[PDB]
Write a structure and sequence with these properties.
Length: about 850
């Protein structure tokens, strides 16, 4: 059949130092299928941290493609080996993870938990079944693990649109960056994230680990419920297991490896407006004016490829978007506390009188094939693609951005079309097994050739690196270069949004779900996708509100702003061939927008703190219910509700004509953020049928949490000048806590040694006859200098009212306290 697998020829754990395991594997027998077997494998197992195990399988006899350390820096590998059945075990005393090598024919290995003896990853073959073997051919790597089908709940392996967050059994997930619209279910999309989270329902419910394959090649991942199998068309096996044991711990461990989420400027949490098709500077000015007139907050105005001179980067349409008017426009935005973001594509038009093209040629920055620059097709027509693996191309990129920024101020950059997208598929190179690989991955759901509508696999990058190997890194690399350009041309914290991504992209950029559609399905689809990118270490995520493609309806757009006002990244965007969909256009949507964006803006200090938490520990802003409630198995399959931070839950209507929603509530007390008198109390988690009128969305806060809020305003800058209102939700079972991070909104290194920041922790507890609310402050200086005052505290979750020396609501007014000054407030019961 497909292969015969490997035997352990030798294996040993180095002793008398930090243990690592080294083994040599030998091919049992050759097979012709999918090409030549690699005869000898080097096999290592090593602990990068007590909570992280690394399994690396390479050709013992040849260097193979690996993601460069410069692209994704990480600890180097453990030495390689020398030139009942037997086993070799690797364990560390402070590690919960135990690795075992089985000297069977073919060989196997497992990783199990010390605490429960539960097997997390099991690559023991079924001897009669080659689909369960490790197979290792030049263009076909096969790695398989069994799974306890009912107990293992898996999440991730992006990027794909799915109706559920938890991965359905019996499917194939393809990772191959492609310009494919996210309104398409199942298909491989713009990004590739070969990570999954595995939550176990038994034996120790809520027990979670992570599994990451550090490989940039195209792959199919087959998940059948009782097994998962990687089928990878190149590179090596570089497998990381993250011990958890909680969901939050897994993401901490994973992002520690791939990079902590980049911080975001405060303004990026404001509302964004964009459209493909804005005709001229007058129109975008008019949109901004109409937002103000509708009294709907607008933070950032975007321009799509319309602004460019005939779709060429680093230029302005001299007729529709003349430089002087654009300068005035951006100046006006800035005077009003607003910001501006333009789009960029990677392809450089081949026009001989275009400065960017001339300079690019001079520094030889473009991707080549057969010794000449590769000629693609995108919006301006013929293009060459910068090789972002080439240091000279990055410098070129920085320089073009500098030049443009010197003439027209910008606040951030949107990088699109960077898979790379190509509108003409090139002919395959005769005889090449790269353009015509032996195993066809399921590209676009049709086994479509990998070179379809992109750069051909035989194209070459700096260092003689093939497109075959580097493809999934293109977007990732451009993001690094663009961020580099921004940091070098402004001392403000940068902001960028990227379409194409790879594992680690979150260290450089925000992301959006791409080309969704104005359909009720896509409204719901935004939630699983939002949650996934949190797992992928990209917490700054959202979808085009009201839908990118196809014309929206009043009701759909109304329900969408309700949901979308809570996306970490909240933007209205649409294609040019559809109806306009600014939020002021319908009264019922505008009224809904004011209500929900009003709450969002009050929650800005909360979002910003969560962003801080994400950069620190990798924990997502928008997170699944089982992150807070991992012991409640009912939450594992929830796909239509989500948390913002630890204790706020959003429960949107996602169907037309509905005025109610059946929403799951985990155990305990929940209070509407829109009406503190409105609450939900259960002794055991269950579904509750919430009232949900056309203009309302259910948003609830759980007992045990404290959230610092500021006032509503038209801009994020204005909001920060409002008083703080503290929301304290008490629990009979636990003291309540909360956190607030404060800085200047633009410090390059968030929470760094520079000291331009303050951290406040809040604490509240009831006694039999008193109630204490207090704070602790780290680095009091910055916050004090900003004059932030807390004037009111609202207390939920008690059945008795409290004051200074069913549920009730208590309010403490005219407090005038300074946020920067630690306090202790004593209240008494009535
Ligand atoms: C504005 C955006 O324009 C482009 O994207 C467009 C396409 O150009 C357009 O044709 C269309 O494409 C859709 C199809 O309509 C839809 O049917 C689906 O195609 C599927 C197909 O259904 C499915 O069967 C499968 O086809 C296989 C088949 O399985 C197999 O057996 C065999 O037959 O082969 C076929 C074909 O390979 O897969 C198809 C997908 O490949 O989905 C496609 C979308 O992929 O709509 C899209 C989306 O609008 C550009 O590509 C986009 O990049 C562009 N959007 C960007 C541009 C901007 C402007 O600057 C910016 O505003 C946007 O934000 C940005 O995203
Ligand atoms: C090279 O870039 C030039 C600058 O943008 C292009 O010329 C401009 O084309 C606009 C329409 O695309 C037109 O409104 C502008 O007036 C014009 N500006 C100037 C200074 O010529 C040029 O476009 C080519 O030449 C024009 C005359 C048309 O024939 C276009 O169809 C051509 O593409 C660009 N040339 C190429 C080869 O890309
Ligand atoms: C707040 O909720 C309570 C209970 O659900 C309800 O009786 C009251 O009318 C609501 N108030 C407003 C202003 O909606
Ligand atoms: C609450 O506790 C404080 C300190 O323990 C005490 O001084 C005070 O008398 C108490 N209040 C009441 C109403 O008993």
């Amino acid at each position: 059949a497909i292969g015969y697998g490997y035997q352990v020829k030798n294996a040993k754990v180095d002793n008398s130092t930090g243990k690592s395991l080294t083994a040599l594997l030998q091919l049992i027998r050759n097979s012709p299928v999918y090409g030549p077997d690699i005869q000898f494998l080097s096999f290592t197992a090593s602990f990068e941290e007590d909570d992280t195990l690394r399994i690396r399988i390479t050709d013992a006899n040849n260097r193979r493609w690996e993601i460069p350390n410069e692209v994704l820096p990480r600890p180097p590998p453990p030495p390689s080996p020398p030139p009942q059945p037997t086993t070799t075990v690797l364990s560390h005393p402070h590690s919960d993870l135990v690795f075992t090598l089985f000297h069977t024919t073919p060989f196997g290995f497992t990783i199990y938990r010390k605490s429960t003896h539960d097997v997390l990853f099991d690559a023991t073959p079924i001897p009669s079944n080659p689909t369960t073997f490790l197979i290792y051919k030049d263009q076909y790597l096969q790695l398989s693990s069994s799974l306890p089908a009912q107990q293992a709940h898996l999440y991730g392996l992006g990027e794909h649109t799915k109706p559920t967050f938890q991965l359905a059994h019996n499917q194939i997930l393809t990772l191959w960056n492609a310009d494919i619209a996210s309104f398409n279910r199942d298909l491989n999309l713009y990004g590739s994230h070969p990570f999954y989270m595995d939550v176990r329902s038994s034996p120790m419910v809520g027990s979670t680990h992570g599994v990451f394959l550090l490989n940039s090649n195209g792959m199919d991942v087959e998940y059948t419920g009782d097994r998962i199998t990687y089928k990878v068309i190149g590179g090596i096996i570089d497998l990381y297991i993250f011990a958890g044991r909680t969901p939050e711990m897994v993401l901490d461990q994973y992002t520690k490896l791939i990079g902590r989420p980049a911080p975001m400027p405060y303004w990026a949490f404001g509302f964004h407006q964009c459209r493909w098709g804005y005709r001229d500077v007058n129109e975008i000015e008019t949109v901004v004016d109409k937002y103000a007139e509708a009294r709907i907050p607008l933070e950032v105005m975007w321009t799509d490829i319309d602004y460019m001179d005939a779709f060429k980067d680093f230029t302005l349409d001299p007729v529709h978007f003349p430089l002087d008017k654009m300068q005035q426009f951006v100046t006006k935005l800035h005077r009003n506390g607003q910001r501006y973001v333009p789009i960029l594509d990677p392809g450089i038009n081949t026009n001989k009188s275009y400065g960017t093209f001339i300079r690019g040629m001079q520094s030889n920055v473009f991707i080549k094939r057969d010794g000449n620059p590769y000629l693609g097709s995108v919006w301006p027509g013929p293009v060459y693609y910068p090789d972002f693996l080439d240091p000279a191309a990055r410098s070129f990129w920085v320089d073009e951005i500098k030049r443009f920024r010197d003439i027209l101020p910008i606040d951030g950059i949107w990088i699109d079309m960077n898979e790379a997208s190509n509108f003409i598929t090139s002919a395959p190179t005769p005889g090449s097994t790269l353009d015509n690989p032996p195993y066809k991955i399921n590209n676009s759901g049709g086994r479509v050739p990998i070179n379809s509508k992109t750069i051909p696999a035989t194209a070459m990058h700096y260092g003689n690196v093939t497109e075959y190997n580097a493809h999934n890194l293109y977007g990732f690399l451009e993001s690094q270069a663009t961020r580099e350009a921004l940091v070098r041309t402004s001392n403000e914290r940068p902001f960028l949004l990227s379409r194409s991504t790879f594992a680690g992209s979150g260290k450089y950029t925000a992301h959006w779900t791409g080309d969704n559609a104005a359909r009720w399905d896509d409204l719901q689809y935004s939630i699983p996708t939002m949650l996934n990118f949190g797992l992928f270490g990209m917490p700054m995520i959202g979808a085009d509100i009201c839908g990118f493609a196809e014309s929206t309806t009043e009701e759909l757009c109304r329900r969408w702003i309700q949901l979308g006002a809570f996306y970490p990244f909240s933007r209205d965007h649409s294609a040019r061939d559809t109806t306009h969909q600014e939020l002021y256009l319908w009264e019922s949507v505008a009224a809904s927008a004011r209500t929900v964006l009003g709450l969002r803006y009050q929650l800005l200090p909360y979002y910003y703190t969560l962003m801080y938490d994400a950069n620190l520990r990798g924990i997502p802003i928008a997170r699944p219910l089982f992150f807070t409630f991992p012991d409640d198995v009912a939450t594992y399959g929830i796909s239509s509700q989500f948390l913002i931070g630890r204790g706020i839950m959003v429960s949107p209507v996602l169907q037309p004509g509905a005025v109610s929603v059946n929403a799951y509530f985990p155990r305990g007390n929940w209070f509407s953020l829109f009406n503190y008198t409105s609450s939900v109390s259960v002794s055991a988690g269950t579904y509750v049928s919430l009232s949900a009128p056309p203009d309302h969305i259910n948003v609830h806060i759980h007992e045990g949490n404290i959230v610092a809020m500021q006032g509503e305003a038209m801009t994020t800058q204005a909001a920060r000048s409002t008083p703080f209102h503290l929301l304290v939700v008490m629990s009979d079972h636990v003291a309540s806590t909360g956190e607030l991070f404060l800085d200047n909104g633009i410090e390059m290194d968030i929470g760094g040694p520079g000291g331009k920041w303050t951290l406040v922790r809040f604490f509240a507890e009831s006694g039999i006859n008193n109630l204490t609310i207090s704070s602790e402050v780290v680095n009091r200086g910055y916050a004090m200098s900003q004059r932030w005052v807390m004037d009111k505290i609202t207390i939920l979750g008690l059945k008795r009212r409290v004051r200074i020396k069913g549920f009730v609501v208590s309010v403490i007014s005219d407090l005038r306290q300074l946020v920067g000054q630690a306090f202790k407030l004593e209240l008494e019961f009535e």
